[PDB]
Amino acid sequence: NQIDLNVTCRYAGVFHVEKNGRYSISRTEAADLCQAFNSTLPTMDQMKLALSKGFETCRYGFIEGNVVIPRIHPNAICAANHTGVYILVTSNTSHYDTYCFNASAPPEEDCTSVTDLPNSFDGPVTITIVNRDGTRYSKKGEYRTHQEDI
Ligand SMILES: c1ccc2c(c1)CCNC2
């Protein structure tokens, strides 16, 4: 009964979360997951400001209303060489990573570790925050509120 949450640096409060290192989060689970980080799904404008501060990934994830990849450098294997906030237009499938936005984060790049899931609720799951530098924080809890997701 375990879930790993890989988190990135924050850029203007926006960060990327990958559940168990694979595309596996539904749009409902994504909102719950951000809620557990005292965060919301980013708006498009919040994501564009994050991009301008240095945020990019090579992973599709939910924002409010769309599924996107922020890209600074053109890479052929990431969003087909696009730069900017790339918007996924056509897909058969429903599960991706998520982006989250925390308003209480620093205004620019914050590459300090994340060391809590402040708004998770009581539950049976061992939830582990994994930072890119390997540091980890675990707690027992839950964050999924939709039965379809559990
Ligand atoms: C924290 C821990 C692992 C990973 C990330 C962040 C991002 C890319 N996928 C691996």
From Swiss-Prot:
Glycans are attached at residues 6, 38, 81, 92, 102. It is found in: Cell membrane; Cell projection, Microvillus; Secreted. Residues 13-102 form the Link domain. N-glycosylated. Disulfide bonds join 9-111, 34-100, 58-78. Expressed in the intestinal epithelium. Hyaluronan binds at residues 22, 59-60, 86. Cell-surface receptor that plays a role in cell-cell interactions, cell adhesion and migration, helping them to sense and respond to changes in the tissue microenvironment. Participates thereby in a wide variety of cellular functions including the activation, recirculation and homing of T-lymphocytes, hematopoiesis, inflammation and response to bacterial infection. Interacts with PKN2. Interacts with TIAM1 and TIAM2. Interacts with HA, as well as other glycosaminoglycans, collagen, laminin, and fibronectin via its N-terminal segment. Interacts with UNC119. Interacts with PDPN (via extracellular domain); this interaction is required for PDPN-mediated directional migration and regulation of lamellipodia extension/stabilization during cell spreading and migration. Interacts with RDX, EZR and MSN (via FERM domain). Interacts with EGFR. Interacts with CD74; this complex is essential for the MIF-induced signaling cascade that results in B cell survival. The lectin-like LINK domain is responsible for hyaluronan binding. This is CD44 antigen.
